């Protein structure tokens, strides 16, 4: 009895829905530490500290393959870049805040795209 929700849900609507969110959160001025995965060593102990180092390119990687059959994949992973940025990095560095920040802009993008739901 409802039809006002914009939640994509489908793997295709999401794929490219998210393809836009991602594209945005990634195009975000706070997305450069996540725009692409670090050198694995750019970040000292990165893979050690970061049990799951995800990025916007890695995000988009999945995206590309339409992997995001759920905004949660998309949420978790993009959230995996912010959180990993929030995990390892210090809220003093450029990236950490850029994580919270992005995570915020991104939040407006997912929200907008009927994403966020978890």
């Amino acid at each position: 009895g409802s039809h006002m929700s914009k939640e994509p849900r489908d793997p295709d609507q999401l794929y490219s829905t998210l393809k836009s969110i991602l594209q945005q959160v990634k195009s975000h001025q706070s997305a450069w530490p996540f725009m692409e995965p670090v050198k694995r060593t750019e970040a000292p102990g990165y893979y050690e500290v970061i049990r799951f180092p995800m990025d916007l390119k890695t995000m988009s990687e999945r995206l590309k393959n339409r992997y995001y059959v759920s905004k949660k994949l998309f949420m978790a992973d993009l959230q995996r870049v912010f959180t990993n940025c929030k995990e390892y990095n210090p809220p003093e560095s450029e990236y950490y805040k850029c994580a919270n920040i992005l995570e915020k802009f991104f939040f407006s993008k997912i929200k907008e795209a009927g994403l966020i739901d978890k």
Partner: peptide
């Protein structure tokens, strides 16, 4: 305005 390094942090030495 594009950082190249990963501002080596210290969260889990």
């Amino acid at each position: 305005s594009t950082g190249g390094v990963k501002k080596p942090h210290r969260y889990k030495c």
